[PDB]
Coordinates of N, CA and C and ligand atoms in Angstrom, one line a residue:
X63 N 12.5 -28.2 73.5 CA 11.8 -29.2 73.5 C 12.7 -30.7 72.9
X64 N 12.0 -31.9 72.0 CA 12.9 -32.4 71.5 C 13.4 -32.7 70.9
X65 N 14.7 -33.3 70.1 CA 15.2 -33.2 69.0 C 15.9 -34.6 69.0
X66 N 17.4 -34.3 68.3 CA 18.4 -35.1 68.2 C 19.8 -35.2 68.7
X67 N 20.3 -34.0 69.9 CA 21.0 -33.7 70.1 C 21.5 -34.1 71.7
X68 N 22.6 -33.7 71.9 CA 23.0 -34.8 73.5 C 22.2 -33.8 74.7
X69 N 21.5 -32.5 74.2 CA 20.7 -32.4 76.0 C 19.4 -32.7 75.1
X70 N 18.4 -33.1 73.9 CA 17.5 -33.4 73.5 C 16.8 -34.4 73.1
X71 N 17.9 -35.4 72.7 CA 17.9 -36.7 72.1 C 17.1 -37.6 72.5
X72 N 17.0 -38.8 72.0 CA 16.1 -39.5 72.1 C 16.3 -40.6 73.6
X73 N 17.9 -40.3 74.4 CA 17.2 -40.4 76.1 C 17.0 -39.5 77.0
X74 N 16.3 -38.4 76.3 CA 15.9 -37.5 77.2 C 14.2 -37.6 76.8
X75 N 13.6 -38.1 76.0 CA 12.4 -38.1 75.3 C 11.5 -38.6 76.5
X76 N 12.0 -39.4 77.2 CA 10.8 -40.1 78.4 C 10.4 -39.2 79.7
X77 N 11.1 -38.1 79.7 CA 10.5 -36.9 80.7 C 9.2 -36.2 80.0
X78 N 9.1 -35.6 78.8 CA 8.1 -35.2 78.3 C 7.3 -35.9 78.1
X79 N 7.3 -37.5 77.5 CA 6.8 -38.3 76.5 C 7.2 -39.7 77.3
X80 N 6.8 -40.2 78.6 CA 6.8 -41.4 79.4 C 7.1 -42.5 79.1
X81 N 5.6 -42.9 77.9 CA 5.3 -43.7 77.0 C 6.4 -44.2 76.0
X82 N 7.5 -43.2 76.3 CA 9.4 -43.7 75.6 C 9.8 -44.7 76.0
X83 N 9.0 -45.2 77.6 CA 9.8 -46.4 77.9 C 8.9 -47.7 78.0
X84 N 7.1 -47.3 76.9 CA 6.3 -48.2 76.9 C 6.7 -50.1 76.4
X85 N 5.4 -50.7 76.4 CA 5.3 -52.2 76.1 C 5.8 -52.1 74.6
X86 N 5.4 -51.1 74.0 CA 5.3 -51.6 72.4 C 6.2 -50.1 71.3
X87 N 7.4 -50.2 71.7 CA 8.0 -49.0 71.3 C 8.8 -49.2 70.0
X88 N 9.0 -48.2 69.2 CA 10.1 -48.3 67.9 C 10.7 -47.8 68.0
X89 N 11.7 -48.1 66.8 CA 12.1 -49.1 66.3 C 12.6 -50.1 67.4
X90 N 12.8 -51.3 66.4 CA 13.4 -52.7 67.2 C 14.5 -53.2 66.3
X91 N 15.3 -53.9 66.7 CA 16.0 -54.8 66.0 C 15.2 -56.1 65.6
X92 N 15.5 -56.5 64.3 CA 14.3 -57.4 63.7 C 15.8 -58.4 63.6
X93 N 15.8 -59.6 64.2 CA 16.4 -60.9 64.4 C 15.8 -62.0 63.3
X94 N 16.6 -62.1 62.3 CA 16.0 -62.9 61.2 C 15.6 -64.1 61.5
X95 N 16.4 -65.1 62.1 CA 16.5 -66.1 62.7 C 15.3 -66.2 63.6
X96 N 15.0 -65.5 64.5 CA 14.1 -65.5 65.1 C 12.7 -65.2 65.1
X97 N 12.8 -64.6 63.9 CA 11.1 -64.0 63.4 C 10.6 -64.9 62.6
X98 N 9.3 -65.7 63.0 CA 8.9 -66.5 62.1 C 8.1 -66.6 60.9
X99 N 8.2 -67.5 59.8 CA 7.5 -67.6 58.7 C 5.8 -67.6 59.5
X100 N 5.0 -67.0 58.8 CA 3.6 -66.6 59.1 C 2.6 -67.4 58.1
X101 N 2.5 -68.2 57.8 CA 2.0 -68.7 56.3 C 0.2 -68.4 56.3
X102 N -0.5 -67.4 57.0 CA -1.6 -66.7 57.5 C -1.6 -65.5 56.8
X103 N -0.3 -64.9 57.1 CA -0.2 -63.8 56.2 C -0.6 -63.1 55.2
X104 N -0.9 -62.2 54.4 CA -1.6 -61.9 52.9 C -0.3 -61.2 52.3
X105 N -0.8 -61.3 51.2 CA 0.2 -60.7 50.2 C -0.1 -59.0 50.6
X106 N 0.9 -58.2 50.7 CA 0.4 -56.7 51.0 C -0.1 -56.3 49.6
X107 N -1.2 -55.4 49.6 CA -1.9 -54.8 48.7 C -1.6 -53.2 48.3
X108 N -0.3 -52.8 48.2 CA -0.3 -51.4 47.9 C -0.9 -50.8 46.5
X109 N -2.0 -49.7 46.9 CA -2.6 -49.0 46.1 C -2.6 -47.9 45.2
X110 N -1.4 -47.6 45.2 CA -1.1 -46.3 45.0 C -1.4 -45.4 43.6
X111 N -1.7 -45.8 42.8 CA -1.9 -45.6 41.4 C -2.9 -43.8 41.5
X112 N -4.1 -43.9 42.4 CA -4.6 -42.6 42.0 C -4.0 -41.9 43.1
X113 N -2.6 -41.6 43.9 CA -2.0 -40.9 44.8 C -2.2 -39.4 44.4
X114 N -2.5 -38.5 45.4 CA -2.5 -37.4 44.9 C -1.3 -36.5 46.0
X115 N -0.3 -36.2 45.8 CA 0.8 -35.6 46.8 C 0.5 -34.0 46.8
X116 N 0.7 -33.6 47.7 CA 0.5 -32.1 47.6 C 1.0 -30.8 48.0
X117 N 2.3 -31.5 49.0 CA 3.0 -30.2 49.6 C 4.5 -31.0 49.9
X118 N 5.8 -30.9 50.3 CA 6.3 -30.7 51.1 C 6.7 -30.2 52.1
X119 N 7.6 -30.6 53.4 CA 7.7 -29.7 54.3 C 8.8 -30.4 55.3
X120 N 9.6 -29.0 55.3 CA 10.5 -29.3 56.6 C 10.3 -29.1 58.2
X121 N 10.0 -30.0 58.9 CA 9.1 -29.7 60.3 C 10.0 -29.9 61.5
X122 N 11.5 -29.6 60.9 CA 12.2 -28.8 62.0 C 12.6 -30.9 62.6
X123 N 12.3 -32.1 62.1 CA 13.2 -32.9 62.4 C 13.5 -34.1 61.2
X124 N 12.7 -33.9 60.0 CA 12.5 -34.3 58.8 C 11.8 -33.7 58.0
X125 N 11.8 -33.7 56.9 CA 10.8 -33.9 55.7 C 9.4 -34.3 55.2
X126 N 8.4 -33.9 55.4 CA 7.1 -34.9 55.1 C 6.5 -34.2 53.5
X127 N 6.8 -35.6 53.2 CA 5.7 -35.4 51.9 C 4.2 -35.4 52.1
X128 N 3.4 -34.6 51.9 CA 2.2 -34.6 52.0 C 1.0 -35.1 51.4
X129 N 0.4 -35.9 51.2 CA -0.9 -36.7 50.3 C -2.3 -35.9 50.3
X130 N -3.2 -36.0 49.8 CA -4.3 -35.8 50.1 C -5.2 -37.3 50.4
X131 N -5.9 -36.9 51.8 CA -6.5 -38.3 52.1 C -7.5 -37.9 52.7
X132 N -8.1 -37.0 51.9 CA -9.8 -36.9 51.8 C -10.6 -37.9 51.1
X133 N -9.9 -38.7 50.7 CA -10.8 -40.4 50.1 C -10.1 -41.0 49.5
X134 N -10.5 -42.3 49.0 CA -9.3 -43.5 49.4 C -8.7 -43.4 47.9
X135 N -7.9 -42.7 47.9 CA -6.7 -42.6 46.9 C -5.7 -43.4 46.3
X136 N -5.0 -43.6 47.8 CA -3.5 -44.2 48.1 C -3.9 -44.7 49.1
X137 N -3.7 -46.6 49.0 CA -4.1 -47.2 50.2 C -3.4 -48.2 50.6
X138 N -3.3 -48.7 51.9 CA -2.9 -50.1 51.9 C -3.7 -50.9 52.8
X139 N -3.4 -52.5 52.3 CA -4.3 -53.1 53.0 C -4.0 -54.7 53.1
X140 N -4.4 -55.8 53.4 CA -3.8 -56.8 52.8 C -2.4 -57.1 54.2
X141 N -1.8 -58.2 53.7 CA -0.6 -58.4 54.6 C -1.0 -58.4 56.0
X142 N -0.5 -57.7 57.0 CA -1.0 -58.1 58.3 C -2.5 -57.5 58.7
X143 N -3.1 -56.3 58.0 CA -4.2 -55.5 58.0 C -5.5 -55.9 58.4
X144 N -6.4 -55.6 58.9 CA -7.7 -55.9 58.8 C -8.4 -54.3 58.2
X145 N -8.9 -54.3 57.1 CA -9.3 -53.4 56.8 C -8.2 -52.3 55.9
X146 N -9.0 -50.9 55.7 CA -8.4 -50.2 54.5 C -7.6 -49.0 55.1
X147 N -6.4 -49.4 55.1 CA -5.1 -47.4 55.8 C -5.0 -46.3 54.7
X148 N -5.3 -45.4 54.6 CA -4.8 -44.2 53.9 C -3.5 -43.7 53.8
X149 N -3.1 -43.3 52.9 CA -1.4 -42.2 53.0 C -1.8 -41.2 53.4
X150 N -1.1 -40.8 54.5 CA -1.5 -39.4 54.9 C 0.2 -38.7 54.2
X151 N 1.5 -39.4 54.9 CA 2.7 -38.5 54.3 C 4.0 -39.8 54.2
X152 N 4.8 -39.2 53.9 CA 5.8 -40.5 53.7 C 7.0 -39.5 54.1
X153 N 8.3 -40.1 54.9 CA 9.6 -39.2 55.5 C 10.1 -40.0 55.7
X154 N 11.6 -39.6 55.9 CA 12.7 -40.6 56.0 C 13.6 -40.3 57.1
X155 N 14.4 -41.1 57.8 CA 15.0 -40.9 59.2 C 16.5 -41.3 58.3
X156 N 17.5 -40.2 58.7 CA 18.9 -40.5 58.0 C 20.2 -40.6 58.6
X157 N 21.1 -41.1 58.3 CA 22.7 -40.7 59.2 C 23.2 -39.5 58.4
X158 N 24.3 -39.2 59.5 CA 25.4 -38.0 59.2 C 26.6 -38.9 58.5
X159 N 26.7 -40.2 58.1 CA 27.5 -40.9 57.3 C 27.0 -42.0 56.8
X160 N 27.4 -43.1 55.5 CA 26.5 -44.2 55.0 C 26.1 -45.1 56.3
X161 N 27.1 -44.9 56.7 CA 27.1 -46.5 58.0 C 25.9 -46.5 58.8
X162 N 25.0 -45.4 59.2 CA 24.1 -45.3 60.3 C 23.0 -44.5 59.6
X163 N 21.7 -44.8 60.1 CA 20.4 -43.6 59.9 C 19.5 -44.0 60.1
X164 N 19.6 -45.4 59.5 CA 18.4 -46.5 59.7 C 17.8 -46.3 61.3
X165 N 16.3 -46.7 61.5 CA 15.9 -46.7 62.9 C 15.5 -48.3 63.1
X166 N 14.8 -48.8 62.4 CA 15.1 -50.3 62.1 C 16.3 -51.0 61.8
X167 N 16.7 -52.1 62.5 CA 18.1 -52.7 62.3 C 17.5 -54.1 61.8
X168 N 18.4 -55.1 60.9 CA 17.9 -56.5 60.4 C 19.4 -56.9 60.8
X169 N 19.4 -57.8 62.1 CA 20.5 -58.6 62.7 C 21.7 -57.5 63.0
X170 N 21.0 -56.5 63.6 CA 21.8 -55.3 63.8 C 22.6 -54.4 63.2
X171 N 22.2 -54.8 61.4 CA 22.7 -53.9 60.4 C 21.8 -52.4 60.5
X172 N 22.4 -51.6 60.7 CA 21.7 -50.4 60.1 C 22.3 -49.7 58.7
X173 N 21.2 -49.3 58.0 CA 20.8 -49.0 56.5 C 21.2 -47.6 56.7
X174 N 21.9 -47.2 55.6 CA 21.7 -45.5 55.7 C 20.6 -44.2 55.5
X175 N 19.2 -45.4 55.4 CA 18.7 -44.5 55.5 C 17.1 -44.9 55.9
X176 N 15.9 -44.7 56.1 CA 14.4 -45.5 56.3 C 13.6 -44.7 55.7
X177 N 12.7 -45.4 55.0 CA 12.0 -44.1 54.4 C 10.2 -45.1 55.1
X178 N 9.4 -44.2 55.6 CA 8.4 -44.4 56.6 C 7.3 -43.9 55.3
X179 N 6.3 -44.7 55.1 CA 4.9 -44.6 54.1 C 3.8 -44.5 55.5
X180 N 3.1 -43.7 55.7 CA 2.3 -43.8 57.2 C 0.9 -43.6 56.5
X181 N 0.2 -44.2 57.1 CA -1.3 -44.8 56.7 C -2.4 -44.8 57.5
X182 N -3.2 -44.3 57.7 CA -4.2 -44.3 58.5 C -5.3 -45.1 58.5
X183 N -5.8 -46.1 59.5 CA -7.1 -46.7 59.7 C -8.4 -46.1 59.0
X184 N -9.1 -46.2 58.3 CA -10.1 -45.5 57.7 C -11.5 -45.6 58.8
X185 N -11.1 -46.7 59.6 CA -12.5 -46.9 60.3 C -12.4 -45.8 61.4
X186 N -11.6 -44.9 61.5 CA -11.4 -44.5 62.4 C -11.5 -42.4 61.9
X187 N -11.9 -42.4 60.5 CA -12.2 -41.1 60.2 C -11.3 -40.4 60.0
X188 N -10.1 -40.0 60.7 CA -9.1 -39.4 60.3 C -8.0 -39.5 61.1
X189 N -7.2 -39.1 60.8 CA -5.4 -39.2 61.4 C -5.4 -39.0 62.6
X190 N -6.1 -37.9 63.3 CA -6.1 -37.5 64.6 C -6.8 -38.6 65.4
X191 N -8.3 -38.7 65.1 CA -9.0 -39.7 65.6 C -7.9 -41.7 65.5
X192 N -7.4 -41.3 64.6 CA -6.7 -43.1 64.5 C -5.7 -43.0 65.5
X193 N -4.9 -42.0 65.9 CA -3.6 -42.2 66.9 C -4.3 -42.5 68.3
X194 N -5.2 -42.2 68.4 CA -5.5 -42.8 69.8 C -6.1 -44.2 70.0
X195 N -5.9 -44.8 68.6 CA -5.6 -46.3 68.8 C -4.9 -47.3 68.6
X196 N -5.1 -48.6 69.4 CA -3.9 -49.4 69.3 C -3.6 -50.0 67.7
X197 N -4.9 -50.0 66.8 CA -4.5 -50.2 65.7 C -4.8 -48.8 64.7
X198 N -4.4 -47.8 64.8 CA -4.9 -46.4 64.4 C -4.0 -46.7 63.2
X199 N -2.9 -47.1 62.8 CA -1.8 -46.6 61.8 C -1.0 -47.6 61.4
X200 N -0.9 -47.7 60.0 CA 0.1 -48.7 59.3 C 0.9 -47.8 58.9
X201 N 2.6 -48.2 59.3 CA 3.4 -47.8 58.6 C 4.2 -48.6 57.3
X202 N 5.0 -48.6 56.0 CA 5.5 -49.0 55.3 C 6.8 -48.6 55.6
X203 N 7.6 -49.2 55.9 CA 9.0 -49.3 56.2 C 9.7 -49.8 55.2
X204 N 11.0 -49.0 54.2 CA 11.5 -49.2 53.7 C 12.9 -49.0 53.7
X205 N 14.0 -49.9 53.7 CA 15.9 -49.5 53.8 C 15.7 -49.1 52.8
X206 N 17.1 -47.8 53.0 CA 17.8 -47.5 52.0 C 19.3 -47.5 52.0
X207 N 20.0 -48.2 51.0 CA 21.5 -48.3 50.9 C 22.2 -47.5 50.2
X208 N 23.7 -47.3 49.9 CA 23.9 -46.8 49.1 C 24.6 -47.3 47.7
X209 N 24.4 -47.0 46.9 CA 24.5 -47.5 46.0 C 24.3 -46.8 44.4
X210 N 23.6 -47.5 43.3 CA 22.9 -46.8 42.4 C 22.0 -45.8 42.7
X211 N 21.3 -44.7 41.9 CA 20.7 -44.0 42.4 C 19.5 -44.5 42.0
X212 N 18.5 -44.2 42.9 CA 17.0 -44.5 43.2 C 16.0 -43.0 42.2
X213 N 15.3 -43.6 40.8 CA 15.6 -42.4 40.0 C 14.0 -41.6 40.5
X214 N 13.4 -42.3 40.9 CA 11.8 -42.3 41.7 C 12.0 -41.4 43.0
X215 N 13.4 -41.5 43.4 CA 13.3 -40.2 44.5 C 14.2 -38.6 44.1
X216 N 14.7 -38.8 42.8 CA 15.4 -37.5 42.5 C 13.9 -36.5 42.4
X217 N 12.9 -36.5 42.2 CA 12.0 -34.9 42.1 C 12.2 -34.3 43.7
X218 N 12.1 -36.0 44.6 CA 12.3 -35.2 46.0 C 13.6 -34.7 46.4
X219 N 14.9 -35.2 45.8 CA 15.5 -34.4 46.2 C 16.0 -33.0 45.7
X220 N 15.7 -32.6 44.4 CA 15.7 -31.6 43.9 C 15.0 -30.6 44.6
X221 N 13.7 -31.1 45.1 CA 12.9 -29.8 45.6 C 13.8 -29.5 47.4
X222 N 14.5 -30.0 47.9 CA 15.2 -30.0 49.1 C 15.8 -28.5 49.6
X223 N 16.3 -28.3 48.2 CA 17.1 -26.5 48.5 C 15.7 -25.4 48.7
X224 N 14.2 -25.9 48.5 CA 13.6 -24.8 48.6 C 12.7 -25.3 50.0
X225 N 13.6 -25.8 51.2 CA 12.9 -26.0 52.5 C 13.8 -26.4 53.0
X226 N 15.1 -25.7 53.2 CA 16.5 -26.0 53.9 C 15.8 -26.0 55.1
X227 N 15.1 -24.6 55.4 CA 15.4 -24.7 57.1 C 13.5 -25.2 57.5
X228 N 13.6 -25.3 58.9 CA 12.3 -25.3 59.9 C 10.7 -24.6 59.2
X229 N 9.9 -25.2 58.8 CA 8.9 -24.3 59.0 C 8.7 -24.2 57.0
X230 N 9.9 -24.2 56.3 CA 9.5 -24.1 55.2 C 8.6 -24.9 54.5
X231 N 7.9 -24.9 53.3 CA 7.1 -25.9 52.5 C 7.1 -24.9 50.9
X232 N 7.1 -26.2 50.4 CA 6.7 -26.0 48.9 C 5.9 -27.0 48.3
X233 N 5.2 -26.5 47.5 CA 4.3 -27.3 46.4 C 4.9 -28.2 46.0
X234 N 4.3 -29.4 46.2 CA 4.6 -30.7 45.7 C 3.8 -31.7 45.4
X235 N 3.4 -31.5 44.3 CA 1.8 -32.2 43.5 C 2.6 -33.4 42.4
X236 N 1.5 -34.4 42.1 CA 2.0 -35.3 40.8 C 3.1 -36.1 41.7
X237 N 3.5 -36.1 42.5 CA 4.8 -37.0 43.1 C 4.6 -38.6 43.2
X238 N 5.0 -39.6 42.3 CA 4.5 -41.0 42.7 C 5.2 -42.0 43.7
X239 N 4.3 -41.8 44.8 CA 5.5 -43.5 45.5 C 5.6 -44.0 44.7
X240 N 5.0 -44.5 44.2 CA 5.5 -46.3 43.6 C 6.7 -46.4 43.1
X241 N 7.5 -45.0 42.7 CA 8.9 -45.1 42.1 C 9.9 -44.8 43.8
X242 N 9.4 -45.0 44.9 CA 10.3 -45.4 45.7 C 10.3 -47.0 46.4
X243 N 9.2 -47.8 45.6 CA 9.5 -49.1 46.0 C 10.1 -49.7 45.7
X244 N 10.6 -51.1 46.4 CA 11.7 -52.1 46.0 C 10.7 -53.0 45.4
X245 N 11.6 -54.2 44.3 CA 10.3 -54.7 43.5 C 9.6 -56.0 44.6
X246 N 10.4 -56.9 45.5 CA 9.7 -57.4 46.4 C 9.3 -56.7 47.7
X247 N 7.9 -57.3 47.5 CA 7.0 -57.0 48.8 C 6.9 -58.0 50.0
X248 N 8.0 -58.6 50.2 CA 7.9 -59.8 51.3 C 8.3 -58.5 52.6
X249 N 8.1 -59.0 53.7 CA 8.1 -57.9 54.9 C 8.2 -58.8 56.0
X250 N 8.5 -58.1 56.9 CA 8.1 -58.5 58.9 C 7.3 -57.5 59.2
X251 N 6.6 -57.5 60.3 CA 5.5 -57.2 60.7 C 5.7 -57.4 62.6
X252 N 5.2 -56.0 63.1 CA 4.8 -56.6 64.5 C 4.5 -55.3 65.2
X253 N 4.0 -55.2 66.2 CA 3.2 -54.0 66.6 C 4.2 -52.9 67.2
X254 N 3.7 -51.8 66.8 CA 5.1 -51.0 67.7 C 4.4 -49.6 67.6
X255 N 5.1 -48.4 67.4 CA 4.8 -47.1 68.0 C 5.2 -46.2 66.9
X256 N 5.0 -44.6 67.0 CA 5.8 -43.6 66.4 C 7.0 -43.6 66.5
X257 N 8.2 -43.1 66.1 CA 9.6 -43.4 66.6 C 9.8 -42.1 66.9
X258 N 9.2 -40.9 66.7 CA 9.1 -39.6 67.2 C 8.1 -39.5 68.2
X259 N 9.1 -38.7 69.2 CA 7.6 -37.9 69.9 C 6.2 -37.3 69.1
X260 N 5.1 -37.5 69.8 CA 4.8 -38.3 70.9 C 4.3 -40.0 71.2
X261 N 5.6 -40.7 70.3 CA 5.3 -42.2 70.5 C 4.4 -42.9 70.7
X262 N 3.6 -42.6 70.3 CA 1.9 -43.3 70.4 C 2.2 -45.0 69.7
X263 N 1.5 -45.5 70.8 CA 1.8 -47.4 70.5 C 0.6 -47.4 69.5
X264 N 0.1 -46.7 68.3 CA -1.0 -47.2 67.1 C -0.5 -47.9 66.1
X265 N 0.9 -48.3 65.9 CA 1.5 -48.5 64.6 C 1.8 -50.0 64.4
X266 N 0.4 -50.5 63.4 CA 1.7 -52.1 62.7 C 2.4 -51.5 61.8
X267 N 3.5 -52.3 62.1 CA 4.7 -51.9 61.4 C 4.9 -52.9 60.2
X268 N 4.8 -52.5 59.0 CA 5.3 -53.5 58.4 C 6.4 -52.8 57.3
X269 N 8.0 -54.0 57.7 CA 9.2 -53.4 57.0 C 9.9 -54.1 56.1
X270 N 9.8 -53.9 54.9 CA 10.6 -54.6 53.7 C 11.4 -55.3 54.1
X271 N 11.5 -56.4 53.5 CA 13.2 -57.2 53.3 C 13.8 -56.7 52.5
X272 N 13.6 -56.3 51.3 CA 13.9 -55.8 50.1 C 14.9 -54.0 50.0
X273 N 16.1 -53.4 50.9 CA 16.0 -52.3 50.6 C 16.1 -51.7 49.2
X274 N 15.9 -50.3 49.0 CA 16.0 -49.8 47.8 C 17.6 -49.1 47.8
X275 N 18.0 -49.1 46.6 CA 19.2 -48.1 46.6 C 19.2 -47.2 46.1
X276 N 19.9 -46.0 46.8 CA 19.8 -44.6 46.3 C 21.4 -44.4 46.6
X277 N 22.0 -42.9 45.6 CA 23.2 -42.8 45.3 C 23.8 -41.9 46.7
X278 N 25.3 -42.1 46.7 CA 25.7 -41.6 47.4 C 25.4 -39.5 47.7
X279 N 25.4 -39.2 46.3 CA 24.9 -37.9 45.5 C 23.4 -37.4 46.7
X280 N 22.4 -38.2 46.3 CA 21.1 -38.2 47.1 C 21.0 -38.5 48.0
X281 N 21.7 -38.9 49.0 CA 21.5 -39.2 50.7 C 22.6 -38.0 50.8
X282 N 23.4 -37.4 50.0 CA 24.2 -36.1 50.5 C 23.4 -34.8 50.4
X283 N 22.6 -34.9 49.6 CA 21.5 -33.6 49.6 C 20.1 -34.1 50.8
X284 N 20.0 -34.8 51.1 CA 19.2 -34.9 52.6 C 19.8 -34.2 53.6
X285 N 21.5 -34.8 53.7 CA 22.1 -34.4 54.8 C 22.4 -32.6 55.4
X286 N 22.3 -32.1 53.6 CA 21.9 -30.9 53.3 C 21.2 -29.5 54.0
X287 N 20.1 -30.4 54.7 CA 19.1 -29.6 55.5 C 19.4 -29.4 56.6
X288 N 18.7 -28.3 57.5 CA 18.6 -27.9 58.0 C 17.4 -28.1 59.6
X289 N 18.2 -28.4 60.7 CA 16.9 -28.6 62.0 C 16.4 -27.7 62.5
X290 N 17.5 -26.4 62.1 CA 17.4 -24.9 62.6 C 15.9 -24.4 61.6
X291 N 15.4 -23.2 62.2 CA 14.7 -22.2 61.2 C 15.7 -21.2 60.2
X292 N 15.4 -20.8 59.6 CA 15.7 -19.6 58.8 C 16.3 -18.4 59.6
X293 N 17.5 -17.9 59.3 CA 17.8 -17.1 60.5 C 18.7 -17.2 61.9
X294 N 18.4 -18.5 62.0 CA 19.2 -19.2 63.3 C 20.3 -19.9 63.0
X295 N 21.4 -20.4 64.0 CA 22.7 -21.0 63.5 C 22.8 -22.2 63.0
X296 N 23.5 -22.5 61.9 CA 23.3 -23.8 61.0 C 23.2 -25.0 61.8
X297 N 22.2 -25.9 61.8 CA 22.8 -27.5 62.2 C 21.9 -28.3 61.1
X298 N 22.7 -29.1 60.8 CA 22.4 -30.1 59.7 C 21.5 -31.2 60.3
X299 N 20.4 -31.3 59.4 CA 19.4 -32.2 59.7 C 20.4 -33.2 59.4
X300 N 20.9 -34.1 60.5 CA 21.4 -35.6 60.1 C 21.1 -36.3 61.2
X301 N 21.2 -37.5 61.3 CA 21.0 -38.5 62.7 C 20.1 -38.0 63.7
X302 N 18.7 -38.2 62.3 CA 17.3 -38.0 63.0 C 16.8 -39.3 63.2
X303 N 17.7 -40.4 63.7 CA 16.9 -41.7 64.1 C 17.1 -42.0 65.5
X304 N 15.9 -42.6 65.8 CA 16.0 -43.4 67.0 C 16.5 -44.6 67.0
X305 N 17.5 -44.8 68.5 CA 17.9 -46.5 67.9 C 17.2 -47.7 68.2
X306 N 17.1 -48.7 68.3 CA 16.7 -49.9 68.6 C 15.8 -49.9 70.0
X307 N 14.8 -50.0 70.1 CA 14.3 -50.1 71.7 C 13.6 -52.0 71.9
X308 N 13.8 -51.8 73.4 CA 13.6 -53.3 73.6 C 12.0 -53.8 73.2
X309 N 12.5 -55.7 72.6 CA 11.5 -55.8 72.0 C 10.4 -56.5 73.0
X310 N 10.6 -56.7 74.3 CA 9.3 -56.9 75.5 C 9.1 -58.1 74.9
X311 N 7.4 -58.0 75.4 CA 6.5 -58.9 75.0 C 5.9 -59.2 73.7
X312 N 7.1 -59.1 72.1 CA 6.7 -58.8 71.1 C 6.9 -60.3 70.1
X313 N 6.0 -60.4 69.2 CA 6.5 -61.4 68.1 C 6.6 -60.7 67.0
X314 N 7.7 -61.0 65.9 CA 8.0 -60.2 64.8 C 7.9 -61.4 63.6
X315 N 6.8 -61.2 62.9 CA 6.4 -61.7 61.7 C 7.0 -61.9 60.4
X316 N 7.5 -63.2 59.3 CA 7.9 -62.7 58.4 C 7.0 -63.3 57.4
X317 N 6.7 -62.4 56.5 CA 5.5 -63.1 55.4 C 5.9 -63.9 54.4
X318 N 7.2 -64.4 54.7 CA 8.4 -65.1 54.1 C 9.2 -66.0 54.5
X319 N 9.6 -66.7 53.7 CA 10.3 -68.2 53.9 C 12.0 -67.7 53.5
Ligands
3MH431 C1 4.4 -43.4 62.1 C2 5.0 -41.5 62.1 C3 4.5 -40.5 61.9 C4 5.3 -38.9 62.6 C5 6.1 -39.2 62.5 N1 7.2 -40.5 62.4 O1 8.3 -40.4 62.5 C6 6.5 -42.0 62.2 S1 7.6 -43.1 62.3
ZN432 ZN1 9.2 -42.2 61.0

């Protein structure tokens, strides 16, 4: 089944998921000179004060930090969105080396990793129904560069030992995702897809212009996770990113001048 290796990586996905070659796939390169300022965009509203994290899981492709999404507790609205989208999970994509790992690129620049905060449109009732809709998800994408540590990341890095291999989970309550955000909420936005199978075309992407800094030792800990399950040969969880896909008939809009 699908993964990030030579025989089951991104170039193979289209055989099980033909939407891989669709009209609104992600990630894409963000050409900053070509992205037009849209003064009708709103400021993004990120309301995470009531966020209830539950659990962290190694799903064999990434780790997910999951939230209670059974009430409007941690929501994204405004920016390019109509309506209210509820946080369900976040995860990252990262490299084996600091020079690669992000999925979106900015004038072809790759960051060391990229955080995805995944939210579903509450007009659709749940995540499953939302992913059948072209406006079912909003993902806030935040780039990571290696420099100073991000203190708000450390509780995630510290628990990774406990979910080393595929299928492991751990209790992960009272984590506050506000500690993962940069200062500015200036962003680029375009219609896209999940960047992992099933690659569904449901996503309003909102990609923050300002990266966060994480330390070398923090990203080193991501790279000790494993794609395999316990008892199988060790294959380090690195380079779980999809390269940029054709922009096709899409315009990337900037919320800022
Ligand atoms: C939106 C989303 C959901 C599940 C996995 N991944 O990678 C993404 S980007
Ligand atoms: Zn993702």
